[PDB]
């Protein structure tokens, strides 16, 4: 059976979205440079170590879906300079997203999270994303263009033995889920900085960690149309941090108004005909 | 032909959503008391008078759809005590919305706006709402439950001669728009405080003002599932105003996290497993 298509971030940029559109998955080799992965890991390191179990009894909004051997930390902008600057302004990410979402309009980050899987983390069940947060997506027509996509960026090696992600190629066009089986999957073997890109309809799952020693870490960036509400809030991010960002990064974090692709678009998150950024006179690219 | 069903806010509360579900429209008599209409009008009065044309060349996000004889003012919470307290906490509104949106989860205000139509304002073309802001809604399956509804509350008399709203009953279940004609419409004749309730699929239009003397005003409250992005932002509303509100009103304005109806809901606008309100220690019901 056939493997996940691999593409260069540098040379095959225009081929990336068409490939995902056709097959439901693609590996973008060197999506983030090793330098950015290095800085990213450095900055989130302590935050993943202090993170409790997904369903911790201290949480307002516990996650009952992820395994107890999973640590997920989101709202990365205040934690990570590499995230807020380098990845939020990634030229490759933005070309792919504008390729993907042009039918709808503006897009933004629905969630940027680092996930770390402890040794011997079991495989997740095969699934489509968004079903625990956006029930609306299940009511979309089967051929509706994808309203969100997920960049699963390796922050450590992805191997078959350490639980590299499984995908079923072509499953983004499936309606019937009766042939859903691990038998039908292929693996995303990746070096740090490579990214597996899937859609909200691609059937996939985290793999079983079988070494008992390796700790797999990933940066999952769910990008979605600005018409859908993010899983995470940047409302509590200090204004000096927000004002350090580019206008584009600000929009991605919900600190700007948004636009649909309707010819006479009337806009989203507007204030009596004016943008958030104008109204609040929000500054941009003000260094810390 | 048959008229829009009229229901009492007091005695037929449980019948309201089922009626809209069946017919696509209902008139809720005395939705807002005359006292609340009175205070509401008093408070927004100067803000509608200073409002420029919808497509004013000074605007970041001009509205090119509304007539030049329309004045729309939104983000009402900072302007209006009656809005922020009485209508955002309306028991009737919240019963109807929880009736309507229980399949999806939490709902919030996509837009609360006062619209005032000058004398001799022409009829709007027949339309469905949401098509200039949320192209996603057109990709929903035809039988998907409505993801937003619109309360068109009369703030002055609605008469046939002064341009009372037209609706086509049953048109929320139409797929084929070839019998779209003013011939097929009936009118929402209303006293101040009555509300016409429609869905995002109900075909309707503002009427032609024919007296040349009357000024019609309405409060349009588009309520929608929390999975869809509001047309307006409350990000720039002073924190003392937000802290004067109830927790429910805060959630409605995007100053709280939200939940979907998925059995293991992982939530919306959350911060590392915790709510906005906890994280920012947002106070509630702190009087001005
Ligand atoms: O918690 C998350 N559940 C997934 C789906 C899922 C996860 C495990 C087992 C079954 C299903 C999701 O829908 N969205 C995301 C996206 C980024 C990170 C985590 C999640
Ligand atoms: O501008 C708005 N256009 C409408 C649709 C429309 C209006 C006039 C003529 C044709 C179509 C809309 O989709 N949403 C709203 C909702 C509240 C107030 C105004 C509008
Ligand atoms: O662990 C992985 O590689 C994939 C994680 C995932 O699919 C999810 O949590 O939604
Ligand atoms: O003017 C009216 O009564 C209806 C207004 C309306 O439907 C709209 O602006 O979307
Ligand atoms: Ni997943
Ligand atoms: Ni309308």
């Amino acid at each position: 059976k056939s493997q996940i298509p691999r593409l260069s971030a540098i040379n095959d940029l225009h081929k990336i979205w068409p490939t995902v559109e056709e097959h439901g998955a693609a590996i973008i080799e060197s999506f983030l440079s090793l330098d950015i992965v290095r800085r990213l890991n450095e900055e989130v390191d302590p935050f993943v170590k202090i993170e409790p179990i997904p369903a911790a009894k201290t949480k307002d909004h516990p996650n009952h879906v992820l395994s107890t051997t999973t640590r997920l930390v989101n709202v990365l902008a205040p934690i990570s300079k590499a995230y807020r600057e380098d990845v939020l302004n990634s030229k490759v990410l933005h070309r792919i997203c504008s390729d993907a979402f042009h039918v709808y309009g503006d897009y933004w980050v629905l969630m940027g999270a680092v996930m770390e899987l402890a040794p011997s983390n079991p495989a997740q069940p095969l699934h489509r994303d968004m079903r625990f947060s956006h029930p609306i997506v299940e009511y979309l027509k089967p051929d509706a263009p994808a309203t969100s996509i997920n960049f699963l960026v390796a922050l450590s090696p992805f191997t078959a033995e350490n639980g590299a992600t499984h995908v079923i190629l072509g499953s983004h066009k499936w309606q019937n889920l009766s042939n859903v089986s691990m038998d039908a999957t292929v693996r995303a073997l990746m070096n740090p900085g490579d990214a597996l890109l899937i859609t909200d309809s691609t059937i996939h799952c985290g793999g079983a960690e079988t070494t008992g020693t390796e700790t797999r870490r990933l940066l999952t960036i769910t990008m979605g149309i600005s018409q859908l509400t993010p899983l995470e809030s940047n409302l509590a991010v200090p204004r000096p941090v927000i004002e350090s960002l580019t206008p584009l990064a600000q929009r991605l974090l919900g600190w700007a108004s948004q636009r649909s692709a309707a010819p006479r678009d009337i806009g989203l998150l507007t204030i009596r005909g004016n943008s958030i950024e104008k109204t609040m006179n929000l500054k941009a690219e003000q260094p810390l």
Side-chain angles (χ1 to χ4, degrees), chain A residues 51-71:
Chain A
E51 186 57 41
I53 57 162
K57 88 191 207 257
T58 173
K59 281 171 172 170
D60 245 333
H61 289 263
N63 187 319
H64 294 294
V65 183
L66 297 174
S67 65
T68 62
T69 43
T70 306
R71 294 307 181 265

Side-chain angles (χ1 to χ4, degrees), chain A residues 66 115 117 124 127 129 152 158 163-165 204-207 216 218:
Chain A
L66 297 174
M115 288 181 54
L117 303 314
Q124 301 175 319
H127 67 267
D129 294 336
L152 298 147
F158 272 41
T165 316
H204 65 290
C205 64
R216 192 173 59 97
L218 65 94

